Amino acid sequence: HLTPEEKSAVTALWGKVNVDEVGGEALGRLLVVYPWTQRFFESFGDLSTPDAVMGNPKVKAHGKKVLGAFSDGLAHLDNLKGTFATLSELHCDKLHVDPENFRLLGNVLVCVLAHHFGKEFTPPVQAAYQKVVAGVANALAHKY
Amino acid sequence: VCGKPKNPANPVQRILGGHLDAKGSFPWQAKMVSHHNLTTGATLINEQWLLTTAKNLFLNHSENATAKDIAPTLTLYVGKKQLVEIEKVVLHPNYSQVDIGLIKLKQKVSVNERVMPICLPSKDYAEVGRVGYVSGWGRNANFKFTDHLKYVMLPVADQDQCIRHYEGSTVPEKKTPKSPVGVQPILNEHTFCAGMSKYQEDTCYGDAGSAFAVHDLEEDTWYATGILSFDKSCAVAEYGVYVKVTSIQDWVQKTIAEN
Amino acid sequence: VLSPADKTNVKAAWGKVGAHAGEYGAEALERMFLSFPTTKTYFPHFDLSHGSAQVKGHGKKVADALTNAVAHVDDMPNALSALSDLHAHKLRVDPVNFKLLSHCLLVTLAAHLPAEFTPAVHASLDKFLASVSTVLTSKYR
Numbered sequence: 431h432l433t434p435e436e437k438s439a440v441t442a443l444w445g446k447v448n449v450d451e452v453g454g455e456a457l458g459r460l461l462v463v464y465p466w467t468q469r470f471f472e473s474f475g476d477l478s479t480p481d482a483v484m485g486n487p488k489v490k491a492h493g494k495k496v497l498g499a500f501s502d503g504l505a506h507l508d509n510l511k512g513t514f515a516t517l518s519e520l521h522c523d524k525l526h527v528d529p530e531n532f533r534l535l536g537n538v539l540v541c542v543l544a545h546h547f548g549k550e551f552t553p554p555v556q557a558a559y560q561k562v563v564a565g566v567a568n569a570l571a572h573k574y
Numbered sequence: 575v576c577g578k579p580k581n582p583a584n585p586v587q588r589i590l591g592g593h594l595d596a597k598g599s600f601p602w603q604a605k606m607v608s609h610h611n612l613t614t615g616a617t618l619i620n621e622q623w624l625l626t627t628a629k630n631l632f633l634n635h636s637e638n639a640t641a642k643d644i645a646p647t648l649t650l651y652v653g654k655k656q657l658v659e660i661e662k663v664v665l666h667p668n669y670s671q672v673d674i675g676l677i678k679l680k681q682k683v684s685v686n687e688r689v690m691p692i693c694l695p696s697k698d699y700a701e702v703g704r705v706g707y708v709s710g711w712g713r714n715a716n717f718k719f720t721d722h723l724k725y726v727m728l729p730v731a732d733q734d735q736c737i738r739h740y741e742g743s744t745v746p747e748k749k750t751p752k753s754p755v756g757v758q759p760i761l762n763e764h765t766f767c768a769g770m771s772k773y774q775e776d777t778c779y780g781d782a783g784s785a786f787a788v789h790d791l792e793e794d795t796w797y798a799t800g801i802l803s804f805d806k807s808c809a810v811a812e813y814g815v816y817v818k819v820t821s822i823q824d825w826v827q828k829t830i831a832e833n
Numbered sequence: 834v835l836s837p838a839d840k841t842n843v844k845a846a847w848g849k850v851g852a853h854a855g856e857y858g859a860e861a862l863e864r865m866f867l868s869f870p871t872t873k874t875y876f877p878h879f880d881l882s883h884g885s886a887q888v889k890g891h892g893k894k895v896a897d898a899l900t901n902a903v904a905h906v907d908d909m910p911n912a913l914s915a916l917s918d919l920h921a922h923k924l925r926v927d928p929v930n931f932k933l934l935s936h937c938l939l940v941t942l943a944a945h946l947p948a949e950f951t952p953a954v955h956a957s958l959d960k961f962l963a964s965v966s967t968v969l970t971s972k973y974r
């Protein structure tokens with residue numbers, strides 16, 4: 431999975447993320463870049479333009495929760511399946527979310543990290559984060 | 575015996591576009607794999623025969639291969655990854671116009687909640703604006719063959735609109751290859767187009783061979799109205815192009831009666 | 834197909850990229866190779882080490898092709914016909930790879946031009962690169 435070197439570059443970067451902001455910015459961008467996803471979030475209210483989306487407080491708040499789940503995944507790279515089993519079941523059975531979108535959100539997250547960190551978001555740190563997004567996506571798809 | 579799925583497709587949100595196959599609503603759907611590992615669709619139409627397209631059948635073959643060359647190079651599954659063995663393939667005799675083949679299995683499948691044929695219609699359900707459901711194993715928004723089944727809910731579109739989109743004009747001497755994806759569908763009086771202008775989940779590579787299914791609410795039965803032919807639109811071009819099942823019905827019935 | 838508004842977003846964002854296009858191309862390939870090692874198998878003849886001059890050269894050609902697509906957004910299939918045959922028929926590049934390189938270009942732009950990488954511009958570019966990727970794969974067989 432992650433060399434210990436990669437684990438290290440990852441948690442090093444994560445420790446600097448604005449926990450209150452990057453989750454809302456990733457979710458916010460998912461909804462603007464892949465607009466078909468908005469149908470899942472009618473209880474968030476106004477998503478009708480990119481500013482509406484990016485300034486919506488429910489997007490920001492739900493974003494925090496998504497980021498928090500990625501924080502959980504970081505703590506448990508060895509058991510992403512168990513860690514995400516309940517969430518996988520919710521997204522599948524209750525929400526009917528196509529599992530392709532887990533990878534899209536992941537990737538949008540990577541884009542946001544690159545956006546905030548610039549040059550520190552080097553190719554090798556990207557590569558390690560790509561392992562993490564894939565691992566989180568597979569685990570979220572696992573109960574499908 | 576056909577067209578009565580245990581768990582018929584029933585999306586929570588009636589929004590034209592993509593949906594997850596949450597309930598397992600397409601037991602007629604099969605998965606074909608070519609000798610160079612490309613996933614495509616086929617559609618179970620009775621206990622022993624499937625429809626698919628001629629282009630699907632030709633993947634990784636010379637444009638001179640025969641049904642006998644093709645048949646032993648295919649792999650086919652139904653239900654929960656159940657390999658079924660093929661006895662033969664029958665190409666439509668005018669497959670450059672009607673993009674179709676039939677597949678005969680060496681034995682009948684046993685029907686259950688995950689494996690069941692769709693009915694072939696005698697009625698022409700392809701009125702412009704008719705809402706159907708197209709399931710498929712094609713590539714998704716990451717260009718990966720989907721791990722889980724998904725469908726698109728879509729209307730039949732105006733034939734002239736679709737012709738102008740891909741060919742610029744209905745008039746033969748004014749036609750030019752205008753396809754937004756750089757390959758041209760087979761379009762004629764034997765086909766219909768489906769879709770709407772929307773940035774969406776669309777059908778894409780590998781979805782061909784799958785059915786445009788219509789639910790006849792009076793009979794409460796599901797029918798294959800089209801077989802998807804042009805699976806290359808992928809939300810860049812605006813329409814999928816489907817072979818009209820009513821236009822091949824007689825050929826299908828004769829073929830099955832003969833083999 | 835891209836809306837007028839998308840095309841305007843793409844033309845402006847890529848006009849700002851300007852002479853950086855090569856470097857950004859090269860970095861996107863470098864990210865792709867390291868994040869998704871299977872992509873390296875299409876380039877067994879390359880020096881793929883960090884800072885390889887052969888990669889910078891190729892990044893420049895990739896950039897020029899995208900510039901040409903951007904210049905001819907209403908006629909992309911035609912402008913890319915030679916490339917589309919190259920990728921789909923001769924090289925047989927699996928479609929998945931185009932989404933990998935597309936993502937890595939986006940990452941590279943975000944890291945280099947954060948002021949230009951707004952949500953709307955991100956959406957328009959993703960759509961543009963998904964149109965390029967589709968044109969380059971529709972002939973894949």
Ligand code: HEM
Binds near residue numbers: 492517520521532566
């Ligand atoms: C890696 C990707 C994702 C993660 C970590 C994630 C995580 C979560 C979390 C932690 C919650 C709150 C669950 C709870 O309260 O028990 C949630 C809810 C939800 N997620 Fe996701 N999710 C992901 C992807 C997606 C995607 C792609 C969609 C839709 C396109 C989606 C739609 C939802 C919806 C609709 C809810 C319910 C929210 C509400 O009721 O207010 N998720 N997700």
Ligand code: HEM
Binds near residue numbers: 895916920924
């Ligand atoms: C936006 C996507 C892409 C664009 C615009 C692009 C463009 C090009 C261009 C301009 C060439 C050079 C053609 C020449 O010198 O005549 C080329 C060659 C090539 N491309 Fe791509 N390409 C893209 C994606 C990919 C991807 C995803 C792969 C593989 C993972 C790939 C693999 C190749 C290879 C192997 C060559 C041949 C290299 C050589 O000449 O030795 N391309 N591409």
Ligand SMILES: *[C@@H]1O[C@H](CO[C@@H]2O[C@@H](C)[C@@H](O)[C@@H](O)[C@@H]2O)[C@@H](O)[C@H](O)[C@H]1NC(C)=O
Binds near residue numbers: 667
């Ligand atoms: C296959 O096509 C055969 C020939 O097509 C017919 O004759 C040619 C010259 C054209 O005039 C064409 O438009 C006509 O359709 C048909 O005679 C034959 O019925 C077709 N077979 C099936 C099974 O559909």
Ligand SMILES: C[As](C)(=O)[O-]
Binds near residue numbers: 731735770812
């Ligand atoms: C919804 As329409 C016929 O303009 O594609």
